Amino acid sequence: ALLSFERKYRVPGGTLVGGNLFDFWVGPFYVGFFGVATFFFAALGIILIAWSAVLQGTWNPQLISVYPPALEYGLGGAPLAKGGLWQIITICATGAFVSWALREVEICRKLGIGYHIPFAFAFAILAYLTLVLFRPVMMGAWGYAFPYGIWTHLDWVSNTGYTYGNFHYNPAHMIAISFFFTNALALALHGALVLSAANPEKGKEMRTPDHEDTFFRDLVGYSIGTLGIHRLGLLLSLSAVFFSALCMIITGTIWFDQWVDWWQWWVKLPWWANIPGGING
């Protein structure tokens, strides 16, 4: 149940709530108050999904889908069977995600490490919350949120995007995508660089961080450095999500039409708007 080096780390303390009440492990897993909170929120949500599945009349995981209230409910409560289940499950999900983060905080405290991980995870939570809370509230109905189903969540992405033409034309979406793609590029490069130094040509000595700098300077003329690359990975992945959130929060609140039309502001700048030729004249 313990890694060879683990024992010296398994000390009391670090908890945020309840002192030593929940200060223990189950196998590898640390508990803590928020470990218990996670369990409660998660088990509740799952029971409610199963209830919704019964009301839907299916146990097929590829068919089960829990929908938000119809638009006519606005931001009000709804019958369990007509959106209420979705609403309570959303609360459970939020409670579970936030509890997971807070449990991570407890783990950081015990290990005496920085809080970077739960801080990063909070970006993911905030993106989820953009889609099920901030946006629907700003738009004035829970029904603008996505449904909880494997395929139906994708229908919602497809229907929501196409409400505005090709959703590619959303400028914040473009930046988000760039961050996602660049992040994967940098993840591949980071993994490869470290590995190529730790596993050199057959029979050679391990290369050093100096060789990692040299390879990359040789290749592209720059090396961000070992601290830099981990900051970058974090920045890229968090920016990707930040701009994801941004791109959705502006959609249906301050921008309403086909996203393609937004770009016309540049085209119609008065100094060139009326010149004949090109694509737009």
């Binding site: 149940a1 024992r7 398994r10 009391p12 223990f24 492990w25 015990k110 490490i113 000595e205 391990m206």
Partner: protein, 240 residues
């Protein structure tokens, strides 16, 4: 259908990849152990991989993993419960004993070397011709602990030469001796360096280095461990 065969083949590949990846990740820390150090009965479904050998540069030897595992240090902790899964309490001063968040690992008692075989980390005075290039120069600043008392003064920066970065501050105490403070654990301000992890009385307790012009991996671990340990173990006098 070829797309069917493709997707079925991929899932088989993927399970194989995950198996490979998980076993690659068991080269340290396994086999799993009961809380008394004996091999655990349940080792999980993944077996240890075949050993690999790293050839270390600069005649430093080799590393073979997986291999026989031991802490190579005493651990001043004791069970708080008969059943598994509960904390082990410090039997002494956890900070002085290097346990919990003050833990350190029995790393090599030699300094990390760069690609050319020179010490990676040097005090700036011995690093030609390194200098502060931007931000507040902390040399000369008083160092304040979390009790808001002065514990010393910055007399140098220890730099990572190959990476051109500040790694430690060398801090002189009242008695004229110095300690390394990890750069990640200090706040450089305009009139002081503030150290949140340690109260003024805890600086003398920071592990010391054998030679004044180099730091070994073991020393770094003891120092970094001790300083990080203060966030949990000095929390009494802070209050700030």
């Amino acid at each position: 259908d070829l797309a069917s065969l493709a997707i079925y083949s991929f899932w088989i590949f993927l399970a194989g990849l995950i198996y490979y990846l998980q076993t690659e990740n068991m080269r340290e820390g396994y086999p799993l152990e009961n809380e008394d150090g004996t091999p655990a009965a349940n080792q999980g479904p993944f077996p240890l991989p075949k050993p690999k050998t790293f050839i270390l540069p600069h005649g430093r030897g080799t590393l073979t993993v997986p291999g026989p595992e031991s802490e190579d240090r005493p651990i001043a902790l004791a069970r708080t419960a008969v059943s598994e899964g509960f904390p082990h309490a410090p039997t002494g001063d956890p900070m002085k004993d290097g346990v919990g968040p003050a833990s350190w690992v029995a790393r090599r008692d030699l300094p990390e070397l760069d690609g050319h075989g020179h010490n990676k980390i040097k005090p700036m005075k011995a690093a030609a011709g390194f200098h502060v290039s931007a931000g507040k120069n902390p040399i000369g600043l008083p160092v304040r602990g979390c009790d808001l008392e002065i514990a010393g003064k910055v007399v140098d920066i220890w730099v990572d030469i190959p990476e051109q970065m500040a790694r430690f501050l060398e801090v002189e105490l009242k008695d004229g001796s110095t300690r390394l403070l990890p750069m990640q654990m200090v706040k450089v301000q305009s009139n002081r360096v503030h150290v949140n992890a340690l109260s003024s009385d805890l600086f003398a307790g920071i592990p010391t280095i054998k030679s004044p012009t180099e730091v070994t991996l073991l020393e770094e671990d003891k120092i970094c461990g001790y300083v990080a340990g203060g966030l949990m173990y000095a929390a009494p006098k802070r209050k700030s």
